[PDB]
Write a protein that binds this ligand. Structure first.
Ligand SMILES: [Cl-]
Ligand SMILES: [Cl-]
Ligand SMILES: [Cl-]
Lengths: 385, 385, 385
């Protein structure tokens, strides 16, 4: 059984410092998280920082909360060959994919990827991983296989002389495998790399910076530069990224919503019928209430920038931005999260006949009328307490 | 491991009395049920009775065993607007869907629905819910979220001041959300509704009574008014409702068979290759035997009207109606349950060469011939002990 | 949590002797197996041997390691009628499907099948069953329902007067069901069959020997008679059977690879991104190393003919054939296993820019060049330590 009676606004509980940044991890064993099988990681990469390449047993979505850079993501079968022009040697490699604030990047399970910060500000990445994903056939525990360096696996840690995938093989095998000498093998194994997972790129590394499954986009910007499907001039907005807008989501079975609430703005009571909703606050704070099937409050408090609130499938919720407004990115454990509103223009209340509402709430048709047609706005409610 | 060595003909174990009827619930923790993750609920709604609207984390099939009425089922994205004519006010609401005895209604997970009895007899509904359904991402425990009233959640109970989804929110939020006053908020919360989940509709509530996912039918009658795919003039019949006959079943991944056996009639030994079969007896009684992979009898006894026998996937079974005949509705945990017969015109025995049967049963070709061609009937066997 | 820190080269742990052969079973509770929910069974059928028909709750793949014969597999809905000509009686039965060494046979869950050895050598069958398959709705435990004989269920045993599915029913029921007498019923129940599951076919049984779901092939030969997609003239080869080559695999969600390594040949380091890989050695021996996400060696030793090594999804692996060469059949828990190579012409290393490799391994572009372009071969590496 899932323990969903006391949800908590969670902060990271673990941290790993690297040469060029640091990684924060939320508590995988938190009750809500464990039920949904979700993990949350936040990477802070300083300028010229390189998150070494690795792959994991679970699909991931990564929201770029701040900064911009380039990524490299192989994706099997799609040997994407590219030749980096002269200045007369030409290197052959994967496409160099740039990304910026507001981008929702996708990383399928088993696919290695690396990210580099090419901006002046710190690159802040919100990594959502779902272990109860069809793609993961092991167990509900997150594992990340690094190709280089020597990271102190904290994604799940031990929940240890932990290294990269090559440090576990015999010197010989790697010599034959790559056709090299022990001198290189030791560099490969990185027995002495004390930089952890985010490294400082040296003086040269820069020639790259200037830059049907195989044709699918692997990102979508749901930030302020794009249009939001749900928009309230005086209340705020919510931008969606699902398989309808980003085909690849159909394969990872995940999606996201990026919300923005104006001061004192409120998101109408609603619940998601087909998925869990893992909300990470990117700015501001808000009062949030969640109710369960027993009609009990399972959360009633504040959520502040940097915190995560896991809202279980079908649990009813209400959000109210504070004075500083409230902004977030909500990851969904389905390729197409559907939210049902309780009140508003298109809602459950609106669908019900007045005769039904009357008998339901022991009120009169008139009151039933005021009840179902009182709120005229939609998902986002403009300040009007 | 599943404990499937001692199946039992189960009766409801819990009951909740309401103003206009009562709800009975089977034991979710029963060994067979727990293995299959099934729940069984029976609602008895008296004339003018209204089962308040609610939604659950699991998909449901509802067999109308007796009576007739109307239902309202929203289904997200499908804002189905309808205007109830004048008599000069016109109300806007969901389609009013009527149903009658023999109807197999569908209720996808996360969708709220309500039912009203408009007949003179009591409305009896057999509700089958499957918690191990892809649509449920929480846990194997049934949860029903009511929009009104104050039901004492018995679907799973506590397995408590339990109320509807609004009673868990702060008065303010609901005032702003619906644009109303505390006076209405308290009516909404129903802190004082002692009627439970099935309520008496007052003097007026009646104007309704006269009545591509969005286009799919949400019901199919598998009663006596329709034709049965399997029919034995002297034995009985079985009517199927699968995704081939009701497209929506493909989405809930459930199906049903409604059987009718004449006095002393027998259903040939068979097993379902791809699903569990949850049988609810609607009338009569029968002797039933079930055998497992160890060739052991895991059930050998009677099943009487009102009882439920959970037959696990692949377990072999034989049914024999008593003198009063035997009638039932069997819910399947797959959108297309396939049954393999052991003997008869199209059976496993028929498929096997005589040479194979001989060596198999240590008998002669002649006997092997009598063995595989002896029974000429099909799934249903006419009285011929 | 899955215990994947100490993988073992496993040998069968249980055995059941039959009249015409014997059955060996691996340890279902082995840690790796339990994680992946796999079972391994090896049948050795002597000439004129008949493995009695039965069906199980899990899908199976069967590699014919030695010998040849005929099989009969019904598959529901597909009442495939055939009439065995005269010599004036004509028998009606299922298609008689022949098979030979190198064949990868498929057996969907719930489908009964029987196999007969018509060769002079012993028929050796490697049976891979996956209990964590969508098709199995019971529990992670393998169950096989036999239609005849009296097998001492060892697939999982008790993990018992175990018989065939008919021995669990009352004599009467079976008399009516098949329209026969107690004399035949007892033959059916086989209360006295001491032959177990593999029986000697008597003097006569031979007339058979000469021989859109319903149209799908149920086998594919991945032996030496066919072409291998991956081929290294001096190293060896690997032949694949996935849903692209055998459509039916899409339904069972399983696939296989048959590998052949020449003396001292090595399979390049790689991992499967989307499935577990259950390797059964058919000949020779090899040194194998497996590394996990902690960069730790979870296996480092030999695998010899007759042994099974379960390689978990995403775990990195290297194989090196001994002097006698190494040969195997690797079952996949996905209809399309994808392997990513770490080094070679099409690899992760090749995809990465030189600038990335440099900073990654703390080496210079030149060395990075030697690292990523050093190995020119592919999945299979020709002897070149
Ligand atoms: Cl929201
Ligand atoms: Cl039946
Ligand atoms: Cl391999």
């Amino acid at each position: 059984a899932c323990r969903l009676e006391n949800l908590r606004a969670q902060d990271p509980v673990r941290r790993a410092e690297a040469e060029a940044g640091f990684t924060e991890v939320w508590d995988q064993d938190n009750d809500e998280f464990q039920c949904a099988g979700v993990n949350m990681i936040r990477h802070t990469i300083r300028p010229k920082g390189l998150l070494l390449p690795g792959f994991s047993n679970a699909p991931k979505l990564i929201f770029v909360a701040q900064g911009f850079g380039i990524r490299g993501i192989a994706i099997p079968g799609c040997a994407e060959t590219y030749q980096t022009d002269l200045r007369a040697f030409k290197d052959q490699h994967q496409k160099i994919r740039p990304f910026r604030e507001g981008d929702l990047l996708v990383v399928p399970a088993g696919v290695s990827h690396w990210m580099y910060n090419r901006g002046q500000s710190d690159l802040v990445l919100i990594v959502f991983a779902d272990t109860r994903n069809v793609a993961n056939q092991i167990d509900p525990y997150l594992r990340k296989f690094y190709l280089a360096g020597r990271p102190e696996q904290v994604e799940r840690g031990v929940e240890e002389k932990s290294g990269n995938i090559f440090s576990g093989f015999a010197d010989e095998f790697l010599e034959e495998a790559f056709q090299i000498d022990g001198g290189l093998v030791r560099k490969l194994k990185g027995e002495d790399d004390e930089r952890d997972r985010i490294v400082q790129v040296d003086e040269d590394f820069e020639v790259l910076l200037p830059e049907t499954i195989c044709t699918l986009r692997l990102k979508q910007n749901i930030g302020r530069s794009e249009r939001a499907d749900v928009f309230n001039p005086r209340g705020g907005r919510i931008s969606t990224a699902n398989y309808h807008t980003l085909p690849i989501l159909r394969q990872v079975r995940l999606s996201a919503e990026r919300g923005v609430l104006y001061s004192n703005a409120m998101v109408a009571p609603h619940y998601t019928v087909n998925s869990h909703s893992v909300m990470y606050a990117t700015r501001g704070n808000a009062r949030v209430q969640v109710v369960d099937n027993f009609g009990q409050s399972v959360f009633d408090g504040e959520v502040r920038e940097g915190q995560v609130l896991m809202i279980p499938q079908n649990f009813v919720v209400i959000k109210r931005a504070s004075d500083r407004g409230f902004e977030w990115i909500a990851f969904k454990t389905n390729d197409n999260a559907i939210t049902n509103l309780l009140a508003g223009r298109v809602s459950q209340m609106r669908m019900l006949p007045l005769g039904v509402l009357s008998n339901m709430y022991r009120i009169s048709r008139e009151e039933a009328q005021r009840l179902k047609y009182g709120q005229q706005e939609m998902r986002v409610l403009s300040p009007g307490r």
